[model samples]
Target: IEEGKLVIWINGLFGYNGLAEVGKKFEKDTGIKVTVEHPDKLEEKFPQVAATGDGPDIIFYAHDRFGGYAQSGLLAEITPDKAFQDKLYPFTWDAVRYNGKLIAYPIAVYALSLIYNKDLLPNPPKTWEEIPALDKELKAKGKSALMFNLQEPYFTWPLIAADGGYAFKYENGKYDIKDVGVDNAGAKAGLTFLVDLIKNKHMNADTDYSIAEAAFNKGETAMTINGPWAWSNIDTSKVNYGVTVLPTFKGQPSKPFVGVLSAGINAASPNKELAKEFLENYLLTDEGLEAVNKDKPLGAVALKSYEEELAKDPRIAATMENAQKGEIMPNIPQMSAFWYAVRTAVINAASGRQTVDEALKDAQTRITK
Candidate 1:
């Protein structure tokens, strides 16, 4: 072993299978003992761990949570030298950078898309307007047109962005917290259409990605909004499945929020150099990336090493293309309130608690300043 062990605290979002593969490679190549701990509820456990002086030697998590961690000084700043930066995707590095310091190392970067059952609609709808007609067609046949989790933020960005909206602004090499465009003209129009979909029976609140996948597998719903995580559960044979860039509204693309999970070493860890060596030589290498790519079908964040191979997978290629049009989910501390406000507003509009305008306006008021 590397004489000192490195500990990692993470969530199960990456799944045990992938983590195991990562651990095996690290152990085999660097003779480094890696201990991975996944708490059942990371939201609670992470804050508690950070409260105490004791925490993992490394942490793998989504950048969205960076806002809270950064504010509390819980996260360690990572300056992965120029060589490391050259190997990673620019967007990945962008997601990790906070106040000029890189706080995370992104391992996975994925954007949500419209996945359809080809048997149900050979030619999927192109725009948001056509989505309603498709829904009506399915409803006429006693099925739903689309499925989503109204409670989750995963489905919110696609709807809002289609109307040309964004949660925050990026300019001058930093995020502008002043611009809160969630309640802008395009967003309201987008929310109006989404609310109508829920009210007019085009969308089912009960049908989330899991339920929708089951229904699609069994030939019920024609389409659903989801990310790379859905691929593992989908039955590719039961229905001729295909992925499309998320539908657009008016002339704008349904730019979904991209989820990014990254790895970082603790600044205070005893084995800092060893951990860095392991990261550079084992986990982030072309061979290590090849190992991860063997099983995962998501978009790759290895811009220098894996783009050619990633482009070969049509589905992943589409996702990568979609990602180019999308914004990396913010790692800022204020992002927590930002996403919650969006989720609440969209749900209120969908549930008839308020008009789409009212809901979005309220969300903007609460989330911004």
Candidate 2:
């Protein structure tokens, strides 16, 4: 073995079995060791240590975090060939760019969608207006028709933004934080529908992440909203689930937040060339991804050619379909405030502590404050 090692850090190792196997071949071919780590609290720790020039050679994470890293000069711009670039979805590349600079290589794409208990609700609704109807049928069997984590605005975006609600106006790879549009017409209608569900007892008012997940796992809820990552838990719970792109809201797509999993070279890494070599040659290859696909099924692969191959697994197809209609999550730091305020607004409105207008306006006020 060579005296050099390439370190790659991801949030978790669950679905990277393929990368690890590919890393082994990379070591043999390049005579360099490949160490894949999933450090605890990798998100918080990455920026702190990377600034000090003591971070992984390659950082594997979602595109949203790269804006800060690239802005801070902690990431190196990547240069994959035009052929490689053209093989992936165009937006996948767009997601990894900051200030029009491509800073990362796309690995996979993902987004939340409607995951329903097929045995309980054989026919999932196609519009948000139709969702309430399932409640009565499920209630006869003492189960809730639907439950989603009310505390997470990420899960709520598809419904709320369907009629054109936006947190900020985005243009040319930047966000206009001043033009907060969460309290506008479409958002109000979206929020109104959700509030009515609670007001009429179609859904539980006290729902949180754990409550929603638990109800789905126990097969007590006919439908739940989730992404591909939730499959393991839902499978473990033995729920016969099916996934589909979320039902439309008022005749528009249920546009959930899209996230891209990506890898970027550390600007501080001494083995920059080797890191690039590993990413392009070994890590992104068919063999490499096959390992991961075997270990943990991908939600949506960035490679356009890989779609049909991965689609044989229905969940991946459903997730990819949903991601097609989704909006990329805003990568700006200002989004932190938006998440906090919007979720609070959702809770307040659903619980009758505030009207839809009152709750959303409060959110806009808090966000701009």
Candidate 3:
């Protein structure tokens, strides 16, 4: 408080228009000098910086990294009043918590949606079964029905989760890290579905993030499952795209993992009180929330009042709809292992290098090891 200064490290994804503008407004309101830095690879850099007691007073990042930071004593616990907490969607709270402690304040939520070129597919497919017929029709005219980063497990997770698969089990309000589910029956079934798609020539096994995005942008593919982060890369003028929730699979709706961008106070900071006030009192206010969304919308913020208004924008609404149908990503130390293991499994299964069961079992073994 004596210094009247605060620093916040934000990931590059928020861009200058988003969190940078919000930082300016915070400085204007409280007369506090606000410094916002976009560090290269914040997730990888945060642990060492915070450990050395040289990190910023506040850090803005995805909740998936919260566990690692919290476990390393890099983040301080945040305890907002019930009134403020009640205003946010309940699920958002799950992302901010680590070991039953509220470690961060959720700003925005993200989930994958079926983004499609409206002209190519006048009506989006409601189920995976419909994809084949539509793919056939699209191919006749030199187009594809659907495409996504097959090699990346993040894109494959929704299908896996839809079939009752999960990285870790949540039991009695806690995550049981030892009970891994990557090799379960549900996961095998989901992997089989993905393999069939590749075998049927509906989706390419080698497609990466750039390839899928390029295919969609060039109108070579009618649909792709991606999140709001991809919107910036899309030239809306060239592609008349519409967003919808991921289609159903075998009577179960695809449940993508929802991730949240949140702000956490640095445990080593002497100005923790000031940082807390800025997040809980100043930034969460209507004026502050509006300022952040105005520059560049970050899907849906936790506040219900603002969410109602945000839903009026179709893009945000589609994202919110998917978020509602999705499961919160497991924020635990074990997740770091899960990403590498599952991605290998997805690639192996889709490419026929291993059977679905074999690939999933191998992933489970890797995660456990």
Tens digit per residue, CA lDDT, model 2, 160-257: 99998988888764698888989999999888988898889897778887898999999888889987767877878998899997999889999888
The TM-score of candidate 1 is 0.88
Report how far off residue 35 is in candidate 2 (Å).
Answer: 3.9
Worst 10 residues of 2 by lDDT: 11-20
Considering TM-score, which of the candidate structures 1 and 3 is the better prediction for this target?
1
Residue pairs with backbone overlap in model 3: none
Better of 2 and 3 by TM-score: 3
* Global lDDT of model 1: 0.72
Clashes of each: 3, 1, 0
Cα error, candidate 2, residue 228 (Å):
2.3
Show where candidate 2 strays beyond 4 Å: 1-3, 13-18, 28-33, 39-41, 171-174, 195-211, 232-238, 312-314, 347-359, 366-369
Give a tens-digit lDDT track for model 1, residues 105-157.
77778887788988788988878888787777777889877776667766767
Candidates arranged by TM-score, highest first: 1, 3, 2
For this target, which candidate reaches the highest TM-score against the unseen true structure?
Answer: 1
